[PDB]
């Protein structure tokens, strides 16, 4: 699987973000695409997540209300919308696919990473 994120130059006054991350050739159907941000000068922060074949995308409760993930059948795109952009949303946004392992205390890890769209907010 290879994840293809791109675009998202600038969205200054209000809500305009939209990112795609078209996953290519993922075999197991019940997969995931979890969005992660990394502000320049700070570490990661989980911010969303979805299983395209399952339902009800899952959030981090620090963004519930200002974010929204969807999907598509023909193209495998993963569309994410931000509402009410502020100066506190200048970062690089990654899209990753989770993988498994069988053990006690199971926890899904970020197997494959995309490349990252450079959302930027400025005057």
């Amino acid at each position: 699987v290879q994840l293809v994120q791109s675009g998202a130059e600038v969205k200054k006054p209000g809500s305009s973000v939209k990112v795609s991350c078209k996953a290519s050739g993922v075999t197991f159907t019940y997969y995931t695409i979890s969005w992660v941000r990394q502000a320049p000068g700070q570490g990661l922060e989980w911010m969303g997540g979805i299983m395209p074949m399952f339902g009800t995308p899952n959030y981090a409760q620090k963004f519930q209300g200002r974010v929204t993930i969807t999907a598509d059948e023909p193209t495998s795109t993963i569309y994410m919308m931000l509402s009410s952009l502020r100066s506190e949303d200048t970062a690089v946004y990654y899209c990753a696919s989770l993988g498994n392992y069988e053990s006690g205390g199971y926890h899904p890890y970020f197997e494959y990473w995309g490349h990252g769209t450079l959302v930027t907010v400025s005057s």
Partner: peptide, 19 residues
């Protein structure tokens, strides 16, 4: 180097830290 774990604050999935 970043560490992930899980949380039970009723969602708390991807706690990462500062690295």
């Amino acid at each position: 180097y970043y560490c992930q774990s899980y949380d039970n604050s009723l969602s708390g999935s991807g706690v990462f830290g500062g690295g």
